[PDB]
Ligand binder design. Structure first.
Ligand SMILES: COC(=O)[C@]1(Cc2ccc(O)cc2)OC(=O)C(O)=C1c1ccc(O)cc1
Ligand SMILES: COC(=O)[C@]1(Cc2ccc(O)cc2)OC(=O)C(O)=C1c1ccc(O)cc1
Ligand SMILES: CC(C)=CCC/C(C)=C/CSP(=O)(O)OP(=O)(O)O
Ligand SMILES: CC(C)=CCC/C(C)=C/CSP(=O)(O)OP(=O)(O)O
Ligand SMILES: CC(C)=CCC/C(C)=C/CSP(=O)(O)OP(=O)(O)O
Ligand SMILES: CC(C)=CCC/C(C)=C/CSP(=O)(O)OP(=O)(O)O
Lengths: 397, 397, 398, 398
């Protein structure tokens, strides 16, 4: 009901917003039920979704209507994904989007440079613990003027006309925002190595100057990345495509460096997970078993090197496997095997039924688009985790 | 929580809307709890309140800030009241307002002629059973152009610069809108008897031409009213001040004619309740006992003659007693006596505690503003009812 | 330049408004120059267009993007027309549109029942002389609820999913709004003779009760129309399709009853122009010559508009509207020139064609058959003769 | 007339915008006429003002209505100023404001942290040459979170509850945005020398890393400033209060470091103008004469603005700003005239006073002490000499 009561109570300012609801709210409400969120938080997150996210989602692509802006975040072209973060004992719901501006994909705003900032400006008046300083920093570092954006669109596919995209964790009672920034556009227009802009942009952060542990960690990473990535201006995998940050106090925020690569295998998994033998402790290795097992039980691959200040030691990345094009029925079973392997019996026994329940307009045995990415993680304190990124819209036709 | 979760989830577009919430949402949420509305309807009605009513409420009058528009609906000047309709076994929650336009009280819109229509235009896209035909009819009949509105403001007190105000019943799962239209402005500017415009406006309704029962009832009423009210253009009590309609299919809607009067006593109660001996059956009389008892157990008085099509027989009115200036503690006790008298023991045992619970920022023993009006009613099928109109804001300082 | 300064100063809230301006504003500006509107009035009217009309125009239909709402006001489906009203000595510019609501053509608003009322509500705060009472009246008499609107859409072509459209006279420093209301939807849904509801709705106007001259004129018109139009619920020509009003003081507003009809010839022109021999004065007959001459000098219905002002019991000849959808605009240009000479309007004759080319320079008139859309003709006792020409701006800009 | 046509065409979304226009637009229009801006540019700039600036101005403070947010940019508390920049031969018009957000001065937005960024975001869709990278940079370096903003408000007068304000050059057909960022809030909250953060924030600019000339110029400036300003967290004169930038390509933008100071005299003028004997060329010294003469010809701080462009290692004399709040505007008019004669600007001298009266006709200049608010003076090698005069429009309209 909560999605229905809110539709009933709030209606819709235009038809596209209505279409968004009708293809994402039921699933979202479902996901929240399945994660054992309370009714009050179901309303909280859905009300929020309605007010702030619907308008940010732009037009709804569909037969007959072709937006000027087209997103990479999904197969149909829609700037939305819902993911979950699965733990031993709990599941968290997360939203991913690009906030579409009303002139995006036109001369006036080729790369959708404004809307994500506008969304967050609103979340800053809404939420008390939201912080725009890291955003503003990287936006300054990797943003482009109109003429530059225009150039960038002549050398990029329609799907990748973008500098920034946004995430929202529905964590505890809260909305935690995260933004990821693309270096590729600037790299292309300035003809600058991606490595160079990535670390130039990072080295100029306020946090960086005042936190020697971080500064150290970065060096470890630079030294490991330098040989593995291009030292010229090519877009040759593996590359430093994305920079990610949490929209909170800079000192407390994780700084994420992401690699994009098409070639993945056992040696490379190892190379990435351990940073070229740099990591060899028990945990690093227990986590390495995880990931190899997952790969055996089975768009670029993605390696995410996350870094928190007041900490000089790097840690294993999170590794992200593309699933686009692979049957969702098989994946459902795969993930169940792997959940059993991890000793997550509850998660194994419910995954597939619940998956069906998230996306009832579809038969997963015949779809290859709904599971889009999956990432895996190992932590010392928190231990293991899996993030699964779904294409809500694909799962709602 | 529901008022808090929605504040948390939705925030506020400007400060005035925030102030409205902080002085009306808690009370509203409370009232709904007390009427045994379900959580899903608590959210429904509160979400709706947030989206559509907050913006319509205009500025929030307060020390330091004096809106150009000032409402008659409340003591502080705020265009809002919450009322309840108390039955034998149940209670319904109702909202009353004027929808403030962004230029209201200025040259461009002296009488706030537009905002109520704009609100309802939105409720028409929201709700499927909302109907604007009766509105448009009476708005056409009693509305005024800019120059006329300007004139009307030079001959009316600041509190009465208005043609229309709106009501919303939170009934079952629904929002049922009602509008009341003021004849006084047109009467003043056109120097036309109020009686004449009131019935001229009524006689030109589509329903009227096609429904001989109604046409008959109206005649009974006209004949009864004609001697009791002014036949010239004065504003002399009793007068035909307000015309009211339900915003549904014209055939199904109750047409309400309201009298305003300052002189009330036992004979006049009788005169009004029975329409000058016209009504003498058992029910009319059982209802007459009710009302005399209520008056004994204790702004103009108000008499509301309601009329439905496909029905030629008039019925007793609903009579409305002003409470402004009378201690709310006394009234609380009064209403309890009268609830006991009616054999509504449950309602008697809870009124005062619940009243305190609606308005905890206040001590009712010392306030004379919170209970504002009270109306009483008798029906054949539905039987007896009491509507109590509160000044939420007054009850929230 | 004025259209370009305003584009420079205001930009656009979204792309559709940009497209609308890009296919629309140059022409509008040009038309104003050609009509000898001052620079300050050019800005006035273009600024107004930007703020108030662009947002009302909805999406801009175009390859790849198919709005949910499709308008009958133009060939491409765009809810916009620019017309002009030509006199002996002066020309004035007018705009015609439907104001598109954001849910128009969907379950929530099938017949676009709200947007025009919103636009006018905004003109009511803008302009001091705008009056919504007649609009509200006919919107009450002829408007439909959601469920009704839905029924109506299952019996009407996409192009006619509409109750009302709006017009705006750009007349001597001001914007005069007019609205036209369609009787068809309510006819279909209620299964009621169009005649009966047209006149029921008119017979309940406040004006009508307090103005016996009008009450009379109306009777004349009915007496003439009754035999000529269906007495049943059919939608058969000639029919009372549109009721029109000026959005000003009711006592000062013209009430307009429109007929649609496909069959037109010389006996019929005469019949409509004179109201069945009822009119025989010199002016009537000079007007008849005017009109007949126009028909001789030359798919959508013909339109007859019977206008009536209050405090007047005597009917007057209608204005007759000729459809030009499908006929070469190169010919029409030449046709209109002959007729301008014939009327003794040498200046208008010597300019028409060149100035037409100049309104619509992305197009060859010689090749197009959709730019000139209508043309109406009028005789008045005082003002004299008048030609209104309705263009399809968008059609003239692709 | 242009201000009146636009009011006629656009009306107003709410009353505050109306009031803003009614106390504001006549003057602006007049200033443009006096500066010989063409009619089309008058419309351009006034149309732009209507659409983009009015809504940004927030409520209009006035008897009975007390906004939650109170601005330091004017005497009445209104966040608006019109300035003018006077040359030998031409004058240009500029606007200064804070863009007021709808929760500004409340828990949710104590320091008005968002509205200027929103305004610029809208200018970025409007104008092609607007660039937000420097803005974003300093907003990152010098901006504060909600809790921080709250702390800052408990140590600052209502009038200074602000991080940023905005300016707009109406220069040869375009709108050039500039923003100024206040270092004080972050100083107070972090308890950090203003000097240290001013230069930390500057030392992290992208430009700075890739431009050794700038890196150098900056060093010169620091070397001069270091001894002259506090080395502790105090807010004591002279202080590095404002960092300014032009919202264009970083490589092309002037970085401006402002000093505030209450003590000014002839040794100090010299000291600031030359940077402690560091500058001794002919131009420097002719500028010094210019300035000294101005001080001789004559409560808010004095302002020194050190501007620096990239690809330039050599500093240049600042522009010095004299507060005029409290001093009769009748005198100032006469004062400015002397000085115009002294500069050899006869035309500017012969017009100033009359044209001033003409900007502000609801007022007697003779009687007012708040309309002229600041005046800054400048010497350039190429452009030459320059006077910027900052007016309080609202103060000149009540
Ligand atoms: C005779 O033509 C018309 O009245 C209309 C509407 C109109 C009216 C006035 C005006 O200045 C511009 C357009 O002009 C059109 O292009 C067009 O399609 C009109 C119209 C209106 C209603 C209708 O049933 C058919 C056409
Ligand atoms: C020297 O004066 C100024 O820069 C300001 C801001 C300003 C800047 C440019 C412009 O065209 C108009 C106003 O003009 C004012 O009226 C005013 O109050 C300004 C200002 C800015 C910041 C500050 O700390 C004090 C004043
Ligand atoms: C570069 C490629 C191909 C994929 C990266 C995918 C991506 C942006 C993952 C973010 S996971 P994230 O939302 O950040 O989850 P947590 O940090 O909380 O573990
Ligand atoms: C004219 C005076 C003084 C008071 C009238 C008060 C008023 C507008 C009452 C409406 S009661 P109402 O909301 O209409 O309740 P029901 O018809 O459902 O019984
Ligand atoms: C029903 C058909 C086919 C045509 C009617 C066309 C119509 C609504 C024309 C507008 S009449 P109008 O613009 O109002 O012209 P004027 O009376 O101002 O001279
Ligand atoms: C800190 C104090 C007291 C004054 C500084 C005043 C200030 C911000 C003036 C604007 S400088 P600006 O408008 O940018 O003038 P130009 O450099 O364009 O000649």
């Amino acid at each position: 009901r909560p999605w229905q009561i809110l539709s009933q109570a709030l209606g819709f300012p235009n038809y596209d917003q209505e279409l968004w609801w009708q293809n994402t709210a039921e699933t979202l409400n479902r996901v929240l039920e399945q994660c054992d969120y309370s009714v009050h938080l179901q309303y909280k997150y859905l009300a929020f979704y309605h007010k702030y996210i619907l308008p940010s989602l732009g037009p709804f692509r569909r037969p007959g209507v072709e937006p000027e802006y087209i997103s990479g975040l999904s197969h149909g072209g829609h700037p939305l994904a819902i993911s979950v973060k699965i733990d031993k004992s709990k599941t968290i719901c997360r939203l991913g989007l690009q906030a579409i501006g009303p002139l995006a994909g036109t001369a006036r705003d080729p790369l959708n440079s404004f809307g994500d900032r506008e969304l967050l400006k609103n979340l800053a008046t809404l939420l008390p613990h939201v912080d725009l300083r890291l955003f503003d920093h990287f936006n300054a570092q990797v943003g482009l003027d109109r003429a530059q954006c225009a150039v960038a669109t002549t050398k990029l596919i329609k799907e990748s006309h973008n500098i920034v995209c946004t995430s929202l964790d529905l964590k505890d009672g809260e909305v935690i925002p995260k933004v990821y920034f693309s270096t590729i556009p600037k790299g292309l227009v300035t003809e600058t190595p991606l490595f160079d802009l990535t670390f130039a942009a990072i080295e100029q952060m306020e946090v960086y100057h005042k936190d020697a542990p971080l500064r150290t960690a970065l060096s470890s990473l630079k030294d490991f990345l330098r040989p593995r990535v291009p030292t010229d201006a090519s877009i040759t995998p593996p590359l430093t495509g994305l920079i990610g940050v949490d929209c909170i106090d800079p000192m407390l925020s994780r700084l994420k460096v992401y690699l994009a690569t098409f070639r993945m295998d056992l040696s490379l998994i190892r190379d990435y997970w351990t940073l070229g033998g740099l990591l060899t402790d028990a945990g690093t290795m227990k986590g390495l078993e995880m990931v190899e097992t997952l790969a055996k039980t089975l768009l670029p691959f993605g390696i995410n090197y996350a870094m928190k200040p007041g900490t000089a030691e790097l840690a294993p990345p999170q590794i992200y496997f593309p699933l686009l094009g692979i049957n969702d029925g098989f994946i459902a079973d795969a993930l169940v095997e792997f959940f059993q392997y991890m000793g997550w019996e509850d998660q194994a026994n419910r995954y597939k039924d619940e998956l069906k329940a998230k996306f009832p307009n579809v038969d997963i045995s015949q779809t290859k688009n709904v599971h889009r990415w999956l990432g895996v993680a190992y932590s010392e304190t928190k231990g293991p985790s899996m993030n699964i990124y779904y294409d809500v819209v694909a799962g709602n036709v």
